[PDB]
Ligand binder design. Structure first.
Ligand SMILES: CCCCNC(=O)[C@@H](NC(=O)[C@H](C)C[C@H](O)[C@@H]1CSC/C=C/CSC[C@H](NC(=O)OC(C)(C)C)C(=O)N[C@@H](C)C(=O)N1)C(C)C
Length: 377
């Protein structure tokens, strides 16, 4: 019965993917950002220049105040509000209704995006990183405990203005091709995984694999870019520059600041290398890899001028909190968050990226010794 959940996600490029939900009685409709990098369910509950609508607790008879404030900081943006509980449902999701914790956002800073079309956020990670503490049961935990919905979900994010699917409670085999390859969830807080090798155009970056996971590596649908630790970011950029030395790009380009443009349909994709991330597998000394095409880490942006040329922004940035496999990485892949078996699966998506001579892929098996030494402690 997953067919009704296909295409239940919408959004704008670089503004996150959202699903429709309803809270309170009578049901109040709101678009909620899907974020695997956080664990709090929260919605705007007060007027805001960027909000077209918000949660009105006074209009819900099922609403319950928990009389307890909350603050939640994100890599970018933050908000604070009041904790409470209410009935919640997902129109284009499983046909059920559950009582879950809800944070009524009363104040925020650089959180709501102008024209994003969403007024809330659904943290799908674990309680361990929930605010104010792990006692605040996350939405998915509530859903699984109050219903018969299996303990797993999958995400198929499609690029370009953007759409996709969030299959709650299962895997929809028509949304991907080939085989699903699984990597262990190292620890249940963020969806933490271990990267055991990185190659650019088939060239090993030759770095201590611990560097790839310093101080952790996570899968985060709520982050746009591929974020890499300083040392890895530097090595990656250097390699990508040399590969594209043919042309010249402003130093601000590699910083995500300035953007580059080309005559409509003349983008020199071939000069940009593919990136291969090898992930720890399910059996001893075994891993698999996912290959990222330039069409993924070069996010298309509207021409700042009155021109009809294709402009893009470097979607790879430096991080100080570990590797982050954001939406640009998840796009083109079908990703299964198999919480029941503590693993994350990857397969080529049906709405995969397209290149003339190259193609994004998930390949295995590969032999990799000492993978456990790649984890940072
Ligand atoms: C100061 C951080 C303290 C630690 N906090 C966390 O780790 C929290 N989790 C997180 O912050 C997640 C790891 C990140 C989370 O998904 C948050 C969700 S914020 C709501 C998301 C809106 C969709 S636009 C996404 C945006 N795109 C973007 O910036 O594009 C350009 C770079 C081109 C401008 C982006 O990428 N945001 C990153 C940076 C980010 O912050 N994402 C919670 C666990 C409490």
């Amino acid at each position: 019965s997953f067919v009704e959940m296909v295409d239940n996600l919408r959004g704008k490029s670089g503004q996150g993917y959202y699903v429709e939900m309803t809270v309170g009685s009578p049901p109040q409709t709101l678009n909620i950002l899907v974020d695997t990098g956080s664990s709090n369910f929260a919605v705007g509950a007060a007027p805001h220049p960027f909000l077209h609508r918000y949660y009105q607790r006074q209009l819900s008879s099922t609403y319950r105040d928990l009389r307890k404030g909350v603050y939640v900081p994100y890599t970018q943006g933050k908000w604070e509000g009041e904790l409470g509980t209410d009935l919640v449902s997902i129109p284009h999701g499983p046909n059920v209704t559950v009582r879950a914790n809800i944070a009524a956002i009363t104040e925020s800073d650089k959180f709501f995006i102008n024209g994003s079309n969403w007024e809330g956020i659904l943290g799908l990670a674990y309680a361990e990183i929930a605010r104010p503490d792990d006692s605040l049961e996350p939405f998915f935990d509530s859903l699984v405990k109050q219903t018969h919905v299996p303990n797993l979900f999958s995400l198929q994010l499609c690029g370009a203005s953007v759409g996709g699917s969030m299959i709650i409670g299962g895997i929809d085999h028509s949304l991907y091709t080939g085989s699903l390859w699984y990597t262990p969830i190292r620890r249940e807080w963020y969806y933490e995984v271990i990267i055991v090798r990185v190659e650019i155009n088939g060239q090993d970056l030759k770095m201590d694999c611990k560097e790839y996971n310093y101080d952790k590596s996570i899968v985060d649908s709520g982050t746009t870019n591929l974020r890499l630790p300083k040392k890895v970011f530097e090595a990656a950029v250097k390699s990508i520059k040399a590969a594209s030395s043919t042309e010249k790009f402003p130093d601000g380009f590699w910083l995500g600041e300035q953007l580059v443009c080309w005559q409509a349909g003349t983008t020199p994709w071939n000069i940009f290398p593919v990136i291969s991330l090898y992930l720890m597998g399910e059996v001893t000394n075994q891993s698999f890899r996912i290959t990222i095409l330039p069409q993924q880490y070069l996010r298309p942006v509207e021409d700042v001028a009155t021109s009809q040329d294709d402009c893009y922004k470097f979607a790879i940035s430096q991080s100080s909190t570990g590797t982050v496999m954001g939406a640009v990485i998840m796009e083109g892949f079908y990703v299964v968050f198999d919480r029941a078996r503590k693993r994350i699966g990857f397969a080529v998506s049906a709405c995969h990226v397209h290149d003339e001579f190259r193609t994004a892929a998930v390949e295995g098996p590969f032999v990799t010794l000492d993978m456990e030494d790649c984890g940072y402690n």
